[PDB]
């Protein structure tokens, strides 16, 4: 019932920490501040036809 | 029971801690999740979008919208400056309130390269060439085009493609720079000059405008959250 | 069974040499609504650089995962005015400017909440202050919408049989708890461009969707011979956050707690002329 | 050539011969509501071609002194064909939109327009506090004009252009789905907006889903010509529309 | 001993917590369990039982029992309304004190469909038809049968089967509705009209009564416990 | 050996189309005592809907699993009246209205109990209040029926050798304990329609079955030069609950702590007429 | 001696928590607020002969 | 999975006998910059000795791993001067002499930090001191460079939404936290022989690289009828230390907190003559 | 919860202790490490270097 | 997730101690005051050509 996962690097670089949940509600857990996925295409490239950077834009 | 001893920091309230706490509404059933369009997972995604830069801050603008347009004229001396500005994205009045400066003002350190995009909004029959240069930090900003052309620059030719991109490289002695930039962490200057001059045929307006867009590259990053100084209150809102 | 085992880094820079070709990465067209994806490698010679910078601290979870004050009020242990011996706050996030602006950078939010209460007491000034009083105790009561509301410090409503409450004694650690996602809709809405009545009349704006309840506070049974004033501060801390539809940060100062009203503000500061670059 | 586009919805067609690409919302195409996200139980009605078609939203003049305009949806289509009838007769609605803005001028004109769709564009009143009726910002398909100077009449919205009526910098509206009409290069703009809301469905009369804004960043200019103004026209087509909760009409 | 540090929330008393505590009577032998008939494990089981709805609240009822019966007459205009009411199960005076409203008043949110059952208690020789309609939320409640029939409705034929069920569907924009309903979470109206009229032979009473029963369906649910406002005291009981 | 490993959801809605048949789901007969089981799918066309709502929060365990106040009383550290320096409460659940009504929705209950005590102190007003007093200590004594009862604050009975007790010092967390199912019968009875004597005479009602004992409280040895008043609050919290034979909630206000006596009350509120639907 | 069981869902949806008993009396345990079985037939359908919803009730 | 399993000693002395050879270990030349590596075994007869001494306590980690005071200041709960009711310290390590000298034995340092705060309060003397005041509470605020700064004890800036803060109540253990390596460069620099401006003008020395922020402290809401003075002490404790380029310890006394300025000092003490060896 | 009892030394602040403490800047990204010349790991390394001894302290 | 390592000797000479990390940042760990490697050649022997102690230095 114990999760083991790596902890963020620090100066001088067992880089492991242990976590256990004590409460019956998932809202009681600690923040999940270790997800780092991201995708800016939704805001930077919202166009329909794919645009090639090396090619000219309009025609 | 089990012997224990408390260490320093007991009973303190640290605003950035991560601890489990009891739930006040046990076994509460939350509403099912729905995939609303446009999810944002990282503020850099917002920072990478272009936004119009108010370069024309000439202290006598009676109309606020005039700030966004940079004037251009048909007849000008052979070498002349269009505009000049300091590269302080989080401190300079030009970049202070843009979509990138607002994000930066929530942080203390920043690093990475930047994109400046210029768009010509003249007549379809107008033509010209411009030299846009970035001068790394130094004791004196460029005064003439001869000086400016010694640094990083691009020659922009106006044609069917209305826009050109000046990519400001990351040239620095330190991995990071302060948002509240001081002389130690200077970043340089950006200037634009006439390369050939603007030429128009009969029956067209004698003046035109340019606009500038600012955004971050894919190697941009920030650090050290802090409170923004742009917003304040004197009394509790009611 | 006993132990279950659970970095991104920004893009590197590639070496680029001299070029002479028909491709024009620098030239684009903003009219398409497309933000250019050029990199310095596409317009100048560059060396190979291996970056180890990460965007860990820019995530929305970390950006909004800081405790911020949302309300403070004072109440006295003994006084002639009944209404001044307890507090009654309709829960909302628009009271304090900083966290309000942090939240309003997004249109819809969905998160769990962690609430912390900080309570302090002080003796009121007067001509005679010599007294001995034991430690005080406080009660925090949460009343979901539609529930009974106390009208005085010693009302019957304070005998909560179903409303959650906390009893806290001075000198200990601050009180704290967790709250799940308690919205009727699929997400909290910071903005609501609509009306309450179907014929486009009545209340307008976010005020229509604020039905989160109330919070009440009192001294349990403390009633000193001389007045004592206590202040409570409420701190909110989102957890497990998700956000949609970012919107530009506000420029004008706030003026109302339940309205977007504002006064026009200049776009930015001015400078001597378009060429001025000196300090 | 990629500068030609054609769009066919229902019994109507749009052709543009000088145009930029098409912007699709937040990368999401409009679609019908799924079975695992619905909440209402009764069968929906899907008129299809009867409602999903292009409607022309009246026209306006672009002068040298124009400052900008806005339209609020779906109120702008509240009395347009069978879309308006379905809006009147049903409690709930849901639909995406295709917005096409036409503006054409010769090669000797100059100017630039920003076309942007703002979801949940809540606006503030001219006088702090007070209140305004639902006529200061939406009265059908008629367009409402921004103002260069600060608004003073207490009965209408704060129309100061540089704040966009929302208390934010006008230059930062680039974050929303948008496109530019630059007279040198293009004469149209096309945006496809999916349905964006915090609930699966909503009443189409009580709630304004999004607001369309057209703002001249570079003012129009010309010399020695007989054309005094440049008309601007807006066309909108609902997509994947469906309704629920039949009742007596009116709303 | 083992180093430790206390976090916020220590020594607090939260009325909805779940913690182990010492037993004051160690090794106490409890009485053996017995299976008494009629065990109830969930309050929705109670909420799903029918209860008589006092629809006839006409402000001049000198007899309390008259509230439960809805009058009906032999000769009436061709289209006439029998009754009308708002669908606010936890707030409307009609449903406030029923077996369903009492359960709802202990909670803040509710969702799901409802059953309204009508029973004709006239003579065996009497006959008639009634139109019962549910009108979703709108700016105006129906004023005539022509308006009412545009919404969900059922035509009820009185015969050997004395009862008919109007199932009110769950049509809402949000997954849940507030018990203290406001204009934002309106739920609509319910009305009943004469369809054909009531006809009687010679030697029968000229008037009859109807009763209404209210209950929840199998998809009903509630959320967010709270204290009911129906019960209060001013002094300690003795 | 080290680790042993231990949702329902409401019914979905099925798609229904047009129908024309001899079956009549809508028509029924309430005379049978049967509640109709029709669903919207049986009377109108419906779409397929997958519900994820659960009835978790409606269980009796969660409904009754909230701490509620059942008694409060005051006692002074020093006074001339001996009876006013300690409390003596015969345990019962009929004193406070809210929890009483929550419990009386069922006829028989069987549960463990969790008891929490909240104690606060305050100095009484007077012409001279300057004193120094160390922290106070309190004793809570439980006396099963038939045991000796103290008659004064310093009686011998307070030397409990078999009666359980708790000693609590001010400034700490509230006292708490667990109690098993201590009824002689197989379940607690909220109602008792019967008499005490076999010839139908004597006490009548629930009062006959209340033999749970007493609770006593005092200041251990505190006796300040100036009077100090303390208040104790008792909170009950059922655990592992089971209930039988539900009964309708009460309508009339309570008037006696050991009787069902009441005053007749109207069924509900009134309105203008049977067609009035407006506000 | 440690029980591992799932905890209620929450926003953003290791959904596991650990429990150990410290006292010798079962009355000391924490509330068992995770049982969700229910059966309303005892109160809704107390009749002797089974009634089919589609069929007519009385005859 | 559950359990993962993770001495040096000085050199021994070897036995040496009589020697007569051409090798001359004792003779060397310091002009090469080479320190001689001779041992007693090379110049006299020695026995075999097994040393067990270790240099564990001389490591830089242990040498610098001790908490040392870096700043103390006083602030009053109530006073007429607004600036005297709170503290505002620009973070630096040059204020206190002992830790300053310990650090300046190296040119560059890289470490994590552990910060501990010790706060004490005392009542100011006066003609009337009789009052009753509950326990005080304190707030410590950290403002990275460029952030807003409070101008008074009750300013809006104290509502930190992103600045980290600690709330501490008197009578508990001292506050503590950890800080990572927050330098923009690859290592902290104790010395900087350079200027701020590119033309060799402006600020000179270490003062140019000190941009670590500020620390603010206040009483949360305590305001006693009579003044009360509180003192805060800040302690730093490096962790995970690395050091480069050692330099000689300072000889002259310190005179400025942001400069190397000094007064010339004699090399050492004197004695009667070059042969004096007695006390 | 789990029964416990505090032993002597609770809440004391010992300047030479070794305990874990919360981080005030969660998920902070430190600057990459660089191998500067001349790393010193033990003070005895400094002590083993020669230095000129001022033997001629003749008081005048 | 538990590290076991030897502890420094003491008088009278299970010389083992257990450590677990509780926090997600490596900066929160305790001091690593058990590394004892050292190399003085960087400061004592910075010359280019290797010098033999038994041989004469200059020639
Ligand atoms: C736009 C902001 C939405 C965020 C949702 C906030 C909901 C408030 C939930 C907690 C309110 C009650 C807290 C006190 C509870 C207790 O002390 O009993
Ligand atoms: C109808 C209600 C029945 C519930 C049973 C209540 C039985 C009361 C048991 C606890 C009474 C004594 C509590 C104090 C014990 C202690 O402090 O020593
Ligand atoms: C030359 C010395 C360099 C050492 C780096 C010191 C950096 C200081 C970091 C901590 C400063 C703020 C501490 C208070 C934080 C808090 O209480 O919120
Ligand atoms: C309410 C749960 C309390 C848990 C107390 C700490 C853990 C004690 C058991 C040691 C860890 C093993 C856990 C497991 O078996 O999954
Ligand atoms: C009175 C019991 C105290 C238990 C203390 C916490 C548990 C310590 C042992 C770690 C968990 C293993 C338990 C087990 O073996 O079943
Ligand atoms: C936040 C982590 C809390 C850990 C509590 C102490 C450890 C309890 C579990 C017993 C040790 C086993 C750890 C492991 O499985 O790696």
């Amino acid at each position: 019932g114990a999760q083991v996962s790596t902890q963020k690097t620090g100066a001088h670089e067992i880089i492991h920490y242990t976590n256990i949940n004590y409460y019956k509600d998932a809202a009681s857990n600690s923040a999940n501040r270790q997800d780092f996925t991201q995708d800016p295409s939704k805001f930077t490239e919202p166009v329909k036809d794919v645009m090639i950077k090396s090619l000219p834009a309009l025609n | 029971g089990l012997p224990t001893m408390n260490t320093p920091g007991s009973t303190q309230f640290l605003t950035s801690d991560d601890f489990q706490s009891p739930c006040a509404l046990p076994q509460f059933d939350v509403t099912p999740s729905m995939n609303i369009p446009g999810e944002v997972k990282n503020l850099m995604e917002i920072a990478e979008v272009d936004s119009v830069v108010p370069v024309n801050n000439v202290q006598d603008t009676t109309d606020q919208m005039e700030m966004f347009r940079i004037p251009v004229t048909i007849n000008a001396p052979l070498q002349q400056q269009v505009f000049g500005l300091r590269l302080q994205p989080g401190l300079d009045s030009v970049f202070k309130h843009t979509l990138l400066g607002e994000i930066l003002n929530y942080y203390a350190h920043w690093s990475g390269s930047m994109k400046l995009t210029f768009v010509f909004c003249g007549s379809a029959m107008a033509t010209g060439k411009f030299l846009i240069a970035y001068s790394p930090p130094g004791a004196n900003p460029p005064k003439t085009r001869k000086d400016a052309m010694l640094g990083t620059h691009i020659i922009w030719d106006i044609g069917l493609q209305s826009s050109c991109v000046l990519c400001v490289p990351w040239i620095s002695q330190t991995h990071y720079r302060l948002v509240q930039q001081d002389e130690y962490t200077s970043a340089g200057y950006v200037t634009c000059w006439y390369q050939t001059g603007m030429i128009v045929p009969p029956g067209t307006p004698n003046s035109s405008s340019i606009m500038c867009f600012a955004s971050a590259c894919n190697d941009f990053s920030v650090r050290m959250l802090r409170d923004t100084p742009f917003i304040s209150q004197d009394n509790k809102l009611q | 069974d006993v132990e279950e085992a659970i970095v991104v880094h920004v893009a590197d820079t590639m070496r680029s040499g001299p070029s002479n070709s028909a491709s024009v990465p620098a030239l684009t067209a903003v009219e398409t609504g497309h933000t250019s994806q050029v990199t310095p490698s596409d317009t100048m010679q560059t060396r190979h650089v291996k970056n180890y910078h990460s965007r860990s601290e820019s995530t929305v979870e970390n950006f909004l995962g800081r405790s911020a004050c949302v309300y403070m009020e004072e109440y006295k242990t003994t006084d002639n005015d009944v209404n001044k011996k307890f507090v009654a706050w309709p829960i909302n996030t628009k009271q304090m400017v900083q966290m309000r602006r942090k939240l309003e950078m997004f249109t819809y939010l969905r998160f769990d909440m962690e609430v912390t209460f900080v309570i302090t007491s002080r003796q009121d000034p007067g001509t005679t202050l010599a007294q001995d009083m034991p430690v005080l105790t406080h009660q925090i009561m949460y009343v979901p919408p539609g529930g009974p509301i106390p009208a005085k410090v010693d009302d019957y409503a304070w005998q909560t049989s179903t409303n959650p409450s906390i009893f806290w004694t001075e000198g200990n650690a601050p009180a704290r708890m967790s709250i799940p996602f308690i919205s009727i809709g699929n997400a909290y809405s910071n903005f609501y461009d609509g009306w309450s009545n179907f014929d486009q009349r009545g209340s307008y704006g976010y005020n229509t969707l604020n039905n989160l309840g109330h919070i009440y506070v009192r001294h349990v049974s403390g009633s000193s011979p001389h007045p004592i004033t206590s202040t409570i501060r409420v701190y909110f801390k989102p957890k497990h956050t998700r956000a949609w539809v970012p919107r530009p940060p506000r420029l004008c100062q706030y003026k109302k707690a339940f309205s977007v009203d504002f006064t026009p503000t200049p776009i930015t500061d001015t400078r001597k002329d378009i060429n001025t670059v000196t300090t | 050539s990629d500068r030609v586009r054609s769009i066919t919805l229902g019994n109507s067609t749009i052709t543009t011969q000088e145009c930029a690409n098409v912007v699709v919302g937040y990368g999401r195409w409009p679609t019908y509501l799924r079975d695992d996200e619905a909440t209402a139980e009764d069968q929906p009605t899907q008129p299809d071609v009867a409602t999903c078609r292009f409607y022309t939203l009246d026209s306006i003049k672009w002068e040298k002194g124009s400052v900008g305009w806005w339209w609020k949806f779906p109120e702008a289509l509240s009395d347009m064909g069978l879309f308006g009838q379905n809006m009147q007769y049903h409690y709930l609605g849901r639909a995406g939109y295709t917005i096409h803005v036409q503006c054409n001028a010769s090669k000797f004109h100059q100017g630039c327009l920003l076309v942007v769709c703002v979801p949940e564009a809540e606006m503030g009143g001219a006088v702090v506090g007070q209140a305004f009726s639902a006529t200061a910002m939406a009265n059908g398909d008629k367009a409402y004009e921004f103002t260069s100077a600060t608004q003073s009449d207490q009965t209408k919205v704060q129309t100061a252009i540089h704040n966009a009526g929302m208390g934010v910098g006008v230059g930062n509206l680039t974050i929303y789905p948008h496109q530019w009409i630059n007279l040198r290069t293009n004469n149209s703009a096309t945006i496809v907006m999916p349905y964006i809301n915090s609930v699966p469905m909503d009443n189409m009369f009580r709630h304004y889903n999004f607001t369309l804004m057209v703002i001249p960043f570079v003012k129009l200019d010309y010399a020695d010509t007989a054309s005094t103004y440049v008309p601007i026209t807006v066309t909108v087509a609902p997509m994947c529309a469906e309704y629920n909760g039949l009742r007596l009409a009116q709303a």
Side-chain angles (χ1 to χ4, degrees), chain A, chain B, chain C, chain D:
Chain A
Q3 294 82 17
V4 175
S5 66
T6 60
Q7 58 190 11
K8 192 84 178 57
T9 190
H12 206 131
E13 196 57 35
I14 56 171
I15 69 152
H16 270 163
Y17 76 98
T18 305
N19 182 79
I20 293 174
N21 294 329
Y22 310 116
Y23 303 92
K24 317 190 189 133
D25 292 80
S28 292
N29 295 356
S30 53
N32 39 35
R33 53 181 74 219
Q34 296 205 102
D35 164 44
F36 304 130
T37 58
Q38 62 90 32
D39 190 0
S41 296
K42 293 179 179 179
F43 313 100
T44 58
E45 294 179 353
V47 296
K48 181 174 172 65
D49 295 313
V50 176
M51 292 177 70
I52 307 302
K53 60 187 288 187
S54 56
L55 311 178
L58 283 174
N59 268 328
Chain B
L2 179 68
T4 60
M5 63 168 277
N6 291 340
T7 57
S10 294
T11 92
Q12 86 187 351
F13 171 37
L14 174 61
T15 56
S16 56
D17 67 24
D18 285 1
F19 298 128
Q20 305 172 49
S21 58
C23 192
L25 301 172
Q27 304 299 320
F28 185 86
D29 194 52
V30 300
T31 310
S33 192
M34 175 176 103
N35 63 347
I36 302 153
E39 173 155 28
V40 62
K41 292 177 71 68
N42 191 358
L43 276 296
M44 294 281 83
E45 289 167 8
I46 299 174
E48 287 187 32
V49 182
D50 291 331
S51 58
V52 186
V53 182
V55 176
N56 192 38
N57 299 320
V58 297
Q59 184 167 316
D60 63 358
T61 53
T62 54
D63 186 74
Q64 289 289 309
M65 281 303 270
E66 265 292 320
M67 276 190 195
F68 289 114
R69 291 170 275 197
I70 301 160
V72 166
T73 54
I74 52 166
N75 286 314
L78 289 179
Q79 294 96 18
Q80 184 162 78
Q81 199 175 358
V82 180
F83 73 85
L85 61 83
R86 325 184 64 181
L87 194 79
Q88 309 185 135
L91 182 61
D92 205 4
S93 310
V94 175
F95 300 109
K96 204 158 55 153
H97 288 303
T98 62
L99 195 68
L100 178 63
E102 298 267 37
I103 294 289
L104 262 54
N105 268 272
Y106 275 110
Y107 293 89
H109 297 165
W110 68 280
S111 82
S113 60
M114 293 177 70
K115 290 183 281 225
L116 296 181
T117 308
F118 302 90
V119 62
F120 182 69
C121 301
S123 163
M125 299 306 225
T127 52
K129 294 181 176 67
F130 295 101
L131 189 151
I132 310 166
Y134 165 57
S135 178
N140 277 344
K143 300 294 187 291
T144 82
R145 194 180 58 183
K146 271 283 195 63
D147 298 346
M149 61 79 71
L150 292 170
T152 297
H153 68 279
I154 185 163
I155 307 300
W156 175 23
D157 192 55
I158 288 156
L160 294 174
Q161 313 288 354
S162 66
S163 296
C164 181
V165 185
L166 174 75
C167 190
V168 181
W170 173 254
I171 299 166
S172 179
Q173 65 191 324
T174 47
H175 280 277
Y176 278 88
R177 276 181 164 123
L178 293 172
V179 171
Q180 183 62 255
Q181 280 193 28
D182 63 358
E183 182 65 26
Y184 181 67
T185 61
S186 299
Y189 313 95
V190 179
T191 62
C192 180
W193 310 79
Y194 282 98
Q195 183 69 2
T196 286
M198 191 201 165
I199 305 296
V200 298
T204 55
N206 293 351
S207 301
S208 284
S209 290
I210 293 163
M211 294 183 286
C212 183
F213 294 67
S215 56
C217 283
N218 62 352
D219 61 356
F220 205 93
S221 75
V222 290
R223 198 168 71 161
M224 185 64 73
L225 281 151
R226 69 173 175 112
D227 270 5
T228 187
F230 295 154
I231 203 74
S232 64
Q233 73 187 114
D234 186 74
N235 320 304
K236 204 192 296 156
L237 297 179
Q238 293 177 345
Chain C
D1 184 1
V2 177
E3 293 177 350
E4 51 263 37
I6 312 160
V7 306
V8 178
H9 296 299
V10 301
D12 291 331
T13 305
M14 302 294 141
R15 181 177 181 170
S16 188
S19 69
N20 187 333
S21 61
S23 53
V24 287
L27 281 173
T28 178
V30 298
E31 287 86 349
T32 58
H34 180 273
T35 293
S36 179
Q37 307 282 105
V38 295
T39 60
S41 177
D42 295 299
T43 81
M44 73 202 84
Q45 297 187 43
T46 52
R47 79 193 306 277
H48 177 48
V49 181
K50 272 170 50 49
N51 289 284
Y52 292 99
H53 306 332
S54 68
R55 294 169 166 185
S56 60
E57 217 175 359
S58 305
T59 61
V60 300
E61 182 65 26
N62 285 319
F63 176 71
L64 292 175
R66 299 291 189 88
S67 308
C69 177
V70 296
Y71 189 64
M72 53 204 68
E73 180 149 59
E74 319 185 355
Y75 54 107
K76 294 181 176 67
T77 186
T78 186
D79 201 350
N80 263 341
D81 184 1
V82 68
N83 262 308
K84 186 180 289 293
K85 293 187 286 185
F86 69 100
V87 307
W89 175 52
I91 294 151
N92 69 327
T93 53
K94 315 270 146 191
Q95 294 276 32
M96 295 265 173
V97 171
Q98 292 183 357
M99 180 171 174
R100 181 176 179 174
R101 176 163 167 184
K102 280 185 66 169
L103 291 173
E104 301 197 323
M105 293 177 70
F106 310 96
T107 311
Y108 307 116
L109 291 168
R110 177 178 174 115
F111 47 68
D112 302 319
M113 185 64 72
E114 171 154 279
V115 188
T116 314
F117 293 94
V118 179
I119 297 159
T120 60
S121 295
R122 68 181 189 279
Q123 186 175 14
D124 290 0
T127 57
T128 291
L129 295 174
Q131 65 182 357
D132 176 88
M133 194 84 180
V135 68
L136 294 175
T137 308
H138 309 274
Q139 177 182 3
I140 304 104
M141 185 157 102
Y142 170 55
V143 180
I149 60 181
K152 64 182 181 293
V153 74
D154 65 80
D155 181 65
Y156 81 94
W158 297 98
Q159 74 191 356
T160 73
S161 66
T162 300
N163 298 333
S165 303
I166 295 170
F167 295 85
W168 180 81
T169 310
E170 283 206 8
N172 298 343
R176 173 176 276 182
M177 74 203 77
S178 289
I179 296 275
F181 176 64
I182 60 169
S183 180
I184 51 171
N186 298 99
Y188 294 113
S189 56
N190 293 88
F191 297 88
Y192 176 72
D193 196 18
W195 302 85
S196 56
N197 293 321
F198 289 91
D199 65 9
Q200 305 178 341
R201 182 170 294 107
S203 65
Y204 171 68
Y206 160 70
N207 180 41
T208 306
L209 281 45
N210 192 59
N211 290 318
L212 296 176
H214 293 70
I215 280 161
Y216 294 86
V217 190
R218 65 163 184 162
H219 299 97
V220 172
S221 293
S223 184
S224 34
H226 301 303
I228 293 169
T229 299
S230 301
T231 312
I232 185 166
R233 297 184 163 74
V234 191
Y235 291 79
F236 281 13
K237 161 156 186 312
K239 291 154 56 170
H240 317 139
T241 300
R242 300 185 74 182
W244 296 270
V245 184
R247 52 172 55 228
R250 191 179 167 107
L251 177 61
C252 307
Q253 306 304 296
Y254 291 104
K255 277 183 159 58
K256 298 291 185 181
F258 294 107
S259 184
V260 175
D261 297 327
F262 60 90
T263 308
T265 301
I267 291 292
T268 193
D269 308 61
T270 51
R271 58 176 169 155
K272 182 64 69 177
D273 61 19
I274 195 161
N275 292 317
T276 292
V277 70
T278 61
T279 63
Chain D
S1 176
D2 63 358
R3 298 296 299 278
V4 307
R5 181 70 58 160
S6 175
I7 311 171
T8 304
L9 271 298
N11 67 347
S12 68
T13 302
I14 284 284
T15 58
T16 180
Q17 213 156 327
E18 183 178 2
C19 75
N21 208 344
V22 170
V23 162
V24 183
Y26 293 92
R28 285 271 287 280
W29 198 261
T31 193
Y32 285 107
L33 183 58
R34 270 145 72 71
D35 293 351
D36 63 358
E37 293 179 353
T39 180
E41 269 160 20
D42 67 331
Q43 185 83 247
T45 190
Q46 293 165 358
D48 194 9
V49 299
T51 52
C52 305
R53 58 183 308 288
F54 278 105
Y55 302 102
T56 306
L57 206 72
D58 181 65
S59 193
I60 63 186
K61 295 183 178 180
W62 188 3
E63 306 276 20
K64 293 202 186 193
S66 298
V67 180
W69 311 263
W70 77 85
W71 298 261
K72 294 226 165 194
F73 290 87
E75 182 65 26
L77 305 173
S78 66
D79 63 358
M80 185 64 72
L82 283 169
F83 190 82
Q85 299 303 120
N86 281 275
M87 272 177 51
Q88 283 173 63
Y89 272 94
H90 290 280
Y91 169 43
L92 294 173
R94 187 186 194 276
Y97 303 93
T98 296
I99 301 96
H100 200 271
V101 181
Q102 294 100 16
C103 182
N104 67 85
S106 83
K107 288 198 172 23
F108 292 68
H109 286 75
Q110 72 192 28
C112 192
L113 295 170
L114 174 63
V115 185
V116 58
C117 294
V118 181
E120 310 287 344
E122 207 196 315
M123 292 180 183
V127 175
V128 299
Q130 301 297 337
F132 48 87
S133 62
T135 301
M137 65 182 179
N139 188 13
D141 61 356
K142 84 175 287 303
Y144 282 75
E145 280 158 350
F146 284 108
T147 312
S148 183
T150 71
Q151 188 55 254
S152 180
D153 197 344
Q154 65 182 357
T155 65
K156 53 176 66 177
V157 162
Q158 183 54 259
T159 56
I161 179 58
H162 53 92
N163 281 184
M166 286 177 289
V168 304
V170 70
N172 296 335
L173 293 176
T174 300
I175 188 59
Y176 300 118
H178 75 289
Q179 212 154 49
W180 298 85
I181 294 176
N182 189 9
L183 305 184
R184 297 174 91 267
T185 59
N186 62 326
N187 60 31
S188 72
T190 311
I191 300 158
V192 174
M193 294 299 291
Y195 175 79
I196 293 159
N197 199 353
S198 61
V199 287
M201 293 197 163
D202 214 7
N203 180 266
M204 286 173 136
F205 269 98
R206 187 161 57 167
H207 184 47
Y208 306 117
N209 277 306
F210 74 94
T211 293
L212 178 70
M213 315 193 152
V214 177
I215 303 169
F217 266 78
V218 176
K219 65 179 73 175
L220 184 74
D221 210 17
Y222 54 81
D224 271 350
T225 180
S227 297
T228 55
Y229 57 84
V230 175
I232 299 169
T233 296
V234 178
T235 315
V236 183
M239 296 174 75
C240 297
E242 56 185 350
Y243 309 85
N244 224 337
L246 188 60
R247 70 230 199 290
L248 151 64
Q250 204 51 77

